[PDB]
């Protein structure tokens, strides 16, 4: 079982950890559990139905704390998947993660109330869904795009601010007395923001057609300006994902290059005189004529990996025309090298016939 012991720990934790296949299946579903738990937590917030609300909601609360307490422990052991952490030191060392500690804090509070907590109970389920991330790559991705677009965004934000301030103030002095709505500058600022975002509550508006003629321009500007940063950041994502697709072809290229050099040093360490190079010999003797056989084993695996890295990059539009460039150019070079050979034999028979 120990073979399966480490197999399941490693592979199933990599699923549990950063996955690539179908780990989001489990993760989206446990998401659904805790999230729907939250929803029915709000379902208790309907007095007409809150009774049955709690009636099933405490059911779901039991389910939730069970799910994430066991997730705590099982992620612990499955983290035996990690080479650098195996046993006492490693897993009694890595537990001091802030994500982990807030995990156990909220979870022990969960079992405590699972041993009038409605509000903070909402907060802890909140922290569960927050726990979905573990990496902040959301914020990382965002701030990247933002800083990438910093001067554009500041442009929009500034000019929109000015339209808001100006037009609001103007109409405040446009319907100062004809409407109880617009009676303080605080009033108008509420109106300006509620308007320029195209929300349109309706609880205020101008009636003096002069004031209406004020808004009936500054709206045309501001509302679009407020609509910009959504549109900008939306594209900004789109552009980023396209170009990253292209580069993705290269990282595919990179891993075969990424491994061939491994076999390269695996070749160099194979000298019988290089007993100081005990790295691969101990790797083999631990994975254990035959030793020179093992030399040929690793070194020949290096040679085959050599052609492997030769195919590390397959295509890419500019790199693909790099390759077709390679075709015509290198075929030419083959031909020129031939002509080199021709001139070389002629240089040899220069003395041969003289």
């Amino acid at each position: 079982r120990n073979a399966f012991y480490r197999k399941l720990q490693n592979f199933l934790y990599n699923v549990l950890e950063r996955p690539r296949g179908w780990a989001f299946i489990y993760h989206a579903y446990v998401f659904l559990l805790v999230f729907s738990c939250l929803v029915l937590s709000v379902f208790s917030t309907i007095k007409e139905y809150e009774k049955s609300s709690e009636g099933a909601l405490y059911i779901l609360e039991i389910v939730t704390i069970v799910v994430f307490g066991v997730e705590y422990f099982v992620r612990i052991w499955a983290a035996g998947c990690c080479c650098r952490y195996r046993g006492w030191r490693g897993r009694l060392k890595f537990a001091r993660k802030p994500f982990c500690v807030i995990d156990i804090m909220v979870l022990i509070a969960s079992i405590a109330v699972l041993a009038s907590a409605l509000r903070s109970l909402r907060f802890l389920q909140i922290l569960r869904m927050i726990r979905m991330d573990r990496r902040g790559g959301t914020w990382k991705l965002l701030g990247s795009v933002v800083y990438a677009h910093s001067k554009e965004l500041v442009t929009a934000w500034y000019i929109g601010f000015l339209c808001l301030i100006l037009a609001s103030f103007l109409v405040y002095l446009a319907e100062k007395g004809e409407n109880d709505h617009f009676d303080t500058y605080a009033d108008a600022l509420w109106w300006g923001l509620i308007t320029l975002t195209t929300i349109g509550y309706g609880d205020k508006y101008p009636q003096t057609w002069n004031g209406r003629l004020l808004a009936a321009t500054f709206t045309l500007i501001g509302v679009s300006f407020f609509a910009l940063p959504a549109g900008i950041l939306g594209s900004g994502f789109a552009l980023k994902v396209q170009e990253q697709h292209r580069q993705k072809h290269f990282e595919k290229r990179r891993n075969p290059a990424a491994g061939l050099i491994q076999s390269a040093w695996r070749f160099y360490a194979t000298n019988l005189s290089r007993t100081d190079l005990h790295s691969t010999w101990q790797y083999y003797e631990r994975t254990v004529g035959l030793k020179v056989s093992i030399r040929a084993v690793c070194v020949m695996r290096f040679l085959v990996s050599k052609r492997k890295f030769k195919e590390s990059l397959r295509p890419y539009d500019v790199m693909d025309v790099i390759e077709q460039y390679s075709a015509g150019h290198l075929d030419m070079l083959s031909r020129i090298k031939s002509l080199q050979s021709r001139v070389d034999q002629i240089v040899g028979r220069g003395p041969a016939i003289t």
Partner: protein, 143 residues
């Protein structure tokens, strides 16, 4: 050397399981399992292919001794392996840290052991700063 020839005949018979005079693919997978690895059959095929002079599907002792007598400076992959070094030195400045080397050698391709990557950096770091100049190391290994 004659003793080299003898050790190579010894290893050949080691791969020469059935003793026919060549190393078929079956003995190759056999000896790989004996060493402990599960090489795919196409893998043993390409090993023969780059060892099989005649192209018969078996590694004769001729091909065996020729490989066993050839050195790394007898392989002709200088700029190739240098580009393959360049990948991990993404900056392409000639120095890749022992950090990146060690880490990726722990989680890429046939990742080696700690002493494997350790001797790798010790031979690839000769000046003593962890930053592994790679073109020097290919220059030192390829000659």
């Amino acid at each position: 050397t004659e003793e080299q020839i003898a050790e190579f005949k010894e290893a050949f018979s080691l791969f020469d399981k059935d003793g026919d005079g060549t190393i078929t693919t079956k003995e190759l997978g056999t000896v790989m399992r004996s060493l402990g690895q599960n090489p795919t059959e196409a893998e043993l095929q390409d090993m023969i292919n780059e060892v099989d002079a005649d192209g018969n599907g078996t590694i004769d002792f001729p091909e065996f001794l020729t490989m066993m007598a050839r050195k790394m400076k007898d392989t002709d992959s200088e700029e190739e392996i240098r580009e393959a070094f360049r990948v991990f030195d993404k900056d392409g400045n000639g120095y890749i840290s022992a950090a990146e080397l060690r880490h990726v050698m722990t989680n890429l391709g046939e990742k080696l052991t700690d002493e494997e990557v350790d001797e790798m950096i010790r031979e690839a770091d000769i000046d003593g700063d962890g930053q592994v100049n790679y073109e020097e190391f290919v220059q030192m290994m390829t000659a």
